[PDB]
Write an enzyme that holds these catalytic residues in place. Sequence first.
Site, PDB file in Angstrom:
ATOM      1  N   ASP A 236     -40.167  12.192   7.754  1.00  0.00           N
ATOM      2  CA  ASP A 236     -39.745  13.409   8.445  1.00  0.00           C
ATOM      3  C   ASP A 236     -38.733  13.138   9.536  1.00  0.00           C
ATOM      4  OD1 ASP A 236     -39.672  16.150   9.105  1.00  0.00           O
ATOM      5  OD2 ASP A 236     -41.687  16.134  10.011  1.00  0.00           O
ATOM      6  N   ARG A 240     -35.149  16.905  15.568  1.00  0.00           N
ATOM      7  CA  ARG A 240     -36.248  17.553  16.234  1.00  0.00           C
ATOM      8  C   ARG A 240     -37.433  16.617  16.484  1.00  0.00           C
ATOM      9  NH1 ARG A 240     -36.020  19.388  10.989  1.00  0.00           N
ATOM     10  NH2 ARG A 240     -37.620  18.354   9.758  1.00  0.00           N
ATOM     11  N   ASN A 241     -37.514  15.543  15.730  1.00  0.00           N
ATOM     12  CA  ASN A 241     -38.558  14.526  15.901  1.00  0.00           C
ATOM     13  C   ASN A 241     -38.133  13.270  16.619  1.00  0.00           C
ATOM     14  OD1 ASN A 241     -40.342  16.160  14.561  1.00  0.00           O
ATOM     15  ND2 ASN A 241     -39.967  15.220  12.550  1.00  0.00           N
ATOM     16  N   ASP A 254     -43.351  11.373  15.712  1.00  0.00           N
ATOM     17  CA  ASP A 254     -43.946  12.321  14.732  1.00  0.00           C
ATOM     18  C   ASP A 254     -44.208  11.573  13.443  1.00  0.00           C
ATOM     19  OD1 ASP A 254     -45.266  14.634  14.235  1.00  0.00           O
ATOM     20  OD2 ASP A 254     -43.554  15.978  14.087  1.00  0.00           O
TER      21      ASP A 254
HETATM   22  C1  LIG Z   1     -40.419  16.948  29.239  1.00  0.00           C
HETATM   23  O1  LIG Z   1     -40.714  16.333  27.974  1.00  0.00           O
HETATM   24  C2  LIG Z   1     -40.446  17.092  26.892  1.00  0.00           C
HETATM   25  C3  LIG Z   1     -39.872  18.365  27.038  1.00  0.00           C
HETATM   26  C4  LIG Z   1     -39.585  19.097  25.873  1.00  0.00           C
HETATM   27  N1  LIG Z   1     -39.036  20.415  25.935  1.00  0.00           N
HETATM   28  C5  LIG Z   1     -38.320  20.963  24.735  1.00  0.00           C
HETATM   29  C6  LIG Z   1     -37.566  22.284  24.982  1.00  0.00           C
HETATM   30  C7  LIG Z   1     -38.316  23.318  25.837  1.00  0.00           C
HETATM   31  N2  LIG Z   1     -37.432  24.521  26.206  1.00  0.00           N
HETATM   32  C8  LIG Z   1     -38.249  25.115  27.231  1.00  0.00           C
HETATM   33  C9  LIG Z   1     -37.964  26.578  27.505  1.00  0.00           C
HETATM   34  N3  LIG Z   1     -36.674  26.972  26.961  1.00  0.00           N
HETATM   35  C10 LIG Z   1     -36.572  28.437  27.125  1.00  0.00           C
HETATM   36  C11 LIG Z   1     -36.334  26.585  25.567  1.00  0.00           C
HETATM   37  C12 LIG Z   1     -37.124  25.325  25.061  1.00  0.00           C
HETATM   38  C13 LIG Z   1     -38.798  22.678  27.175  1.00  0.00           C
HETATM   39  C14 LIG Z   1     -39.562  21.307  27.026  1.00  0.00           C
HETATM   40  C15 LIG Z   1     -39.925  18.585  24.624  1.00  0.00           C
HETATM   41  C16 LIG Z   1     -40.517  17.324  24.508  1.00  0.00           C
HETATM   42  C17 LIG Z   1     -40.755  16.565  25.654  1.00  0.00           C
HETATM   43  N4  LIG Z   1     -41.347  15.343  25.623  1.00  0.00           N
HETATM   44  C18 LIG Z   1     -42.144  14.829  24.724  1.00  0.00           C
HETATM   45  N5  LIG Z   1     -42.556  13.530  24.907  1.00  0.00           N
HETATM   46  C19 LIG Z   1     -43.360  12.960  24.030  1.00  0.00           C
HETATM   47  C20 LIG Z   1     -43.867  13.683  22.959  1.00  0.00           C
HETATM   48 CL1  LIG Z   1     -44.892  12.919  21.806  1.00  0.00          CL
HETATM   49  C21 LIG Z   1     -43.428  15.015  22.789  1.00  0.00           C
HETATM   50  N6  LIG Z   1     -43.890  15.709  21.745  1.00  0.00           N
HETATM   51  C22 LIG Z   1     -43.641  17.015  21.455  1.00  0.00           C
HETATM   52  C23 LIG Z   1     -43.257  17.917  22.435  1.00  0.00           C
HETATM   53  C24 LIG Z   1     -43.016  19.288  22.217  1.00  0.00           C
HETATM   54  C25 LIG Z   1     -43.155  19.748  20.910  1.00  0.00           C
HETATM   55  C26 LIG Z   1     -43.490  18.858  19.893  1.00  0.00           C
HETATM   56  C27 LIG Z   1     -43.771  17.488  20.135  1.00  0.00           C
HETATM   57  S1  LIG Z   1     -44.178  16.538  18.808  1.00  0.00           S
HETATM   58  O2  LIG Z   1     -44.948  15.326  19.201  1.00  0.00           O
HETATM   59  O3  LIG Z   1     -44.947  17.285  17.748  1.00  0.00           O
HETATM   60  C28 LIG Z   1     -42.635  16.016  18.006  1.00  0.00           C
HETATM   61  C29 LIG Z   1     -41.777  17.209  17.599  1.00  0.00           C
HETATM   62  C30 LIG Z   1     -41.873  15.144  19.001  1.00  0.00           C
HETATM   63  N7  LIG Z   1     -42.614  15.555  23.719  1.00  0.00           N
END
Ligand SMILES: COc1cc(N2CCC(N3CCN(C)CC3)CC2)ccc1Nc1ncc(Cl)c(Nc2ccccc2S(=O)(=O)C(C)C)n1
Length: 361
Positions: A236, A240-241, A254
């Site tokens: 995958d 996004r991952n 992921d």
């Molecule tokens: C501060 O650290 C993070 C911030 C964001 N965001 C993404 C965008 C989002 N904005 C916020 C509001 N806005 C209006 C638009 C979008 C804010 C935060 C996303 C990921 C991380 N960090 C992070 N570290 C380790 C893992 Cl492990 C993980 N894993 C993780 C984090 C989120 C979702 C999925 C996974 S996951 O592990 O399933 C894989 C997809 C990486 N996510």
Amino acid sequence: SMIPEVQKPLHEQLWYHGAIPRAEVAELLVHSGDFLVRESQQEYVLSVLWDGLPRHFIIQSLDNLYRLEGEGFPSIPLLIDHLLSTQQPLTKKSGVVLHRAVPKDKWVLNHEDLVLGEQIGRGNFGEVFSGRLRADNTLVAVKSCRETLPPDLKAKFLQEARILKQYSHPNIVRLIGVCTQKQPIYIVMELVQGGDFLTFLRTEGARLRVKTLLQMVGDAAAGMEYLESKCCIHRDLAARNCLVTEKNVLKISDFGMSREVPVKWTAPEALNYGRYSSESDVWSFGILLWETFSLGASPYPNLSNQQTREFVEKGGRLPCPELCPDAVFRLMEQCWAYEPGQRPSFSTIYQELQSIRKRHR
Ligand SMILES: COc1cc(N2CCC(N3CCN(C)CC3)CC2)ccc1Nc1ncc(Cl)c(Nc2ccccc2S(=O)(=O)C(C)C)n1
């Protein structure tokens, strides 16, 4: 100079495993008579290996006493220690006898060891939160498993933790701990502070010069070379991952699908015949390179998923992004060679990205 172990609360016992699914119990018991205690989907269950199979016994409680079929005890540890000592069969009809308690592994954390912060999105199995280890304020990502998923899918969820326990690389996201004592169960990872690479490209893309973008995909090549060297197929790989540290280092993550549906990133032979390999990961790598130079635009935006399969099967490929150097596009085209054997290795990809990057200011 402490107290007897058997006088400690159930939830402190090393052989109390809490909310681990029935499925996961089979992975933890080895020899005949191995046992652990756990909560059920809610009373307590004594799970014990017998003739190679877990056998599950409801611990009953009446007028504050715990028992299987005989003498009741004021606590589950006292009941456990009596069954262990007397070598009593747990119930007559089953004939099962305890022999050794299986302790939690070094990764298990209590829920109270974590401080949840803000929700940061959703992954395939539940919400993800930013948070902190309570002990030392280390920043973590807390991936939750939606408590109403099938107990069969709490397995595919805990499988990412099983894999990651064995991996260690600068371009692979690090496991910190596993919160299986209470519902909802969590997998605890380092927080990679700049977020996922897709949102990064879409939000920060205007600032990312070609030289920088090449460093970041170089990191993703180094991570994938590492997985290839472990015979681990990611299945995958997509922007996004991938995650971006505060110092712009990219880390692959992921590992739920990984092994030792995202149609637009998947190789034809993987879609057609189910043949996933490091070669089909190189295909996905080419798509990642496209995402990288398109500032996180979505691939094949003119095509449904099914039309993408059909398009590719007659020789269609993504066009060269405006920002993508011609040499990087030539590499991408190799990555998406229809014949999987003709695709470059991750080592070769890493080498060629590094070389191209010296030709960019
Ligand atoms: C501060 O650290 C993070 C911030 C964001 N965001 C993404 C965008 C989002 N904005 C916020 C509001 N806005 C209006 C638009 C979008 C804010 C935060 C996303 C990921 C991380 N960090 C992070 N570290 C380790 C893992 Cl492990 C993980 N894993 C993780 C984090 C989120 C979702 C999925 C996974 S996951 O592990 O399933 C894989 C997809 C990486 N996510």
